[PDB]
Design an enzyme around this catalytic site. Sequence first.
Site, PDB file in Angstrom:
ATOM      1  N   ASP A  54       0.978  -3.798  -8.364  1.00 58.24           N
ATOM      2  CA  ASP A  54       1.046  -2.755  -7.357  1.00 58.24           C
ATOM      3  C   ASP A  54       0.677  -3.502  -6.049  1.00 58.24           C
ATOM      4  O   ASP A  54      -0.495  -3.833  -5.841  1.00 58.24           O
ATOM      5  CB  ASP A  54       0.003  -1.656  -7.654  1.00 58.24           C
ATOM      6  CG  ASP A  54      -0.152  -0.609  -6.564  1.00 58.24           C
ATOM      7  OD1 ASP A  54       0.654  -0.624  -5.594  1.00 58.24           O
ATOM      8  OD2 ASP A  54      -1.077   0.233  -6.674  1.00 58.24           O
ATOM      9  N   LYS A 104       2.441  -4.594   4.660  1.00 54.80           N
ATOM     10  CA  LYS A 104       3.420  -3.658   4.053  1.00 54.80           C
ATOM     11  C   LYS A 104       4.085  -2.748   5.104  1.00 54.80           C
ATOM     12  O   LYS A 104       5.216  -2.284   4.907  1.00 54.80           O
ATOM     13  CB  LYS A 104       2.746  -2.831   2.950  1.00 54.80           C
ATOM     14  CG  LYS A 104       3.702  -1.987   2.103  1.00 54.80           C
ATOM     15  CD  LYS A 104       2.977  -1.582   0.819  1.00 54.80           C
ATOM     16  CE  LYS A 104       3.692  -0.506   0.050  1.00 54.80           C
ATOM     17  NZ  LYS A 104       3.000  -0.235  -1.250  1.00 54.80           N
ATOM     18  N   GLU A 153       7.070   3.054  -6.763  1.00 56.07           N
ATOM     19  CA  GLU A 153       5.735   3.485  -7.155  1.00 56.07           C
ATOM     20  C   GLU A 153       5.736   4.779  -8.024  1.00 56.07           C
ATOM     21  O   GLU A 153       5.116   4.751  -9.099  1.00 56.07           O
ATOM     22  CB  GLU A 153       4.840   3.576  -5.911  1.00 56.07           C
ATOM     23  CG  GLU A 153       4.496   2.195  -5.363  1.00 56.07           C
ATOM     24  CD  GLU A 153       4.179   2.121  -3.876  1.00 56.07           C
ATOM     25  OE1 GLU A 153       3.790   3.156  -3.292  1.00 56.07           O
ATOM     26  OE2 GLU A 153       4.280   1.016  -3.300  1.00 56.07           O
ATOM     27  N   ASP A 174       0.924  11.560  -4.711  1.00 60.41           N
ATOM     28  CA  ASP A 174       0.222  10.327  -4.392  1.00 60.41           C
ATOM     29  C   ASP A 174      -0.568  10.492  -3.124  1.00 60.41           C
ATOM     30  O   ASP A 174       0.018  10.454  -2.044  1.00 60.41           O
ATOM     31  CB  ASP A 174       1.278   9.231  -4.232  1.00 60.41           C
ATOM     32  CG  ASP A 174       0.787   7.828  -4.255  1.00 60.41           C
ATOM     33  OD1 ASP A 174      -0.404   7.613  -3.944  1.00 60.41           O
ATOM     34  OD2 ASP A 174       1.597   6.924  -4.584  1.00 60.41           O
TER      35      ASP A 174
HETATM   36 MG   LIG Z   1      -0.382   3.306  -3.789  1.00 60.41          MG
END
Ligand SMILES: [Mg+2]
Length: 382
Positions: A9, A70, A174, A198
């Site tokens: 991840d 990111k 994800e 999330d």
């Molecule tokens: Mg995450």
Amino acid sequence: AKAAAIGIDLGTTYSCVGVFQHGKVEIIANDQGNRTTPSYVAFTDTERLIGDAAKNQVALNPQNTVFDAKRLIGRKFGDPVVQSDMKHWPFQVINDGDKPKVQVSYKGETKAFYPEEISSMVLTKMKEIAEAYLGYPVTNAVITVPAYFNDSQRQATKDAGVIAGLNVLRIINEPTAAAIAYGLDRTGKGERNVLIFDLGGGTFDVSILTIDDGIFEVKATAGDTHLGGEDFDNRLVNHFVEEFKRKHKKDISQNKRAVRRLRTACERAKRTLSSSTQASLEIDSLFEGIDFYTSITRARFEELCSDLFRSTLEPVEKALRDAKLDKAQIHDLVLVGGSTRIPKVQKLLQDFFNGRDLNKSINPDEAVAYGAAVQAAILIKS
Ligand SMILES: [Mg+2]
Ligand SMILES: NC(=O)N1CCN(c2nc(-c3ccccc3)cs2)CC1
């Protein structure tokens, strides 16, 4: 002996690595005992620091400590998201052919790095964490990305894996990784509509997937950029800025050094609430030499952020519309991100889904890496 593949991840603020061995996933802790590793890289006159070591020295080295790669990866320099984010980062971002690069001092000279080079350093650290556990070099990996990442962002993430010396078995999103962690693609014949909620990571996201005979289809993705983990930290910061005003009679809001040190303490106190009902904040010499010692209770955090938790429901309703599905058509509700551990967040979503139960059996801070590890074992077994 055969080599296992790892699941990574590669997160905005924290990364997590897992490995599937003998019927179970082990989420691998790093050498500081942490099951998640800060996605940070720092540069000095003689060292390149990665993970905890880089994050732990950020206050005194802000220009040469890189984070949030990111948010830049696969984007053009002129992207209005990039331009807005640059106003908040203390490190320099330069324009090299409409592509951003981060510029720092390292070994006595100015050096620039593409976002996929900074992310390859985080990946190298995740690879080394897994190699310390397994006792041999690891080169096969499944790396995850957000469902909303475009082809440029996904390809740039794959490039970070190649630079780190990994064979990227697959790039998966994800929410797909979270569904795989719960085995929702192995329930047999018949389609399954899965909603992945999330909250707690860099960005709040709601995704709806349809899984049919093992095939995943992303039906919708919705969210709120102002519901990321940083907005929960900033809510705690404003609360403590007011507490310092009442206790010490001073306004610290315009002091960058004071606000930054308080934000670091707030972010850690927020995470500490997962294992304790109360987290202490101990900041020496916060402002004008005044020590700031305080605490945050789980009860206070829940009331302070009640509106932020409630702000997540309209994006869920929008994702259901985009997917053309009723709430009653969702088979599984999956929780990802540290905030979903809060029983009040779970209660809000359960009541919104008319009493439906939520999947929380896999630690939400680990579910994405857990699923990436399961997918990596499946591809390596093949
Ligand atoms: Mg995450
Ligand atoms: N954003 C984030 O990472 N965190 C938010 C603050 N945390 C809380 N956990 C709770 C909590 C946990 C278990 C049982 C009861 C309550 C209450 S407030 C920890 C997770």
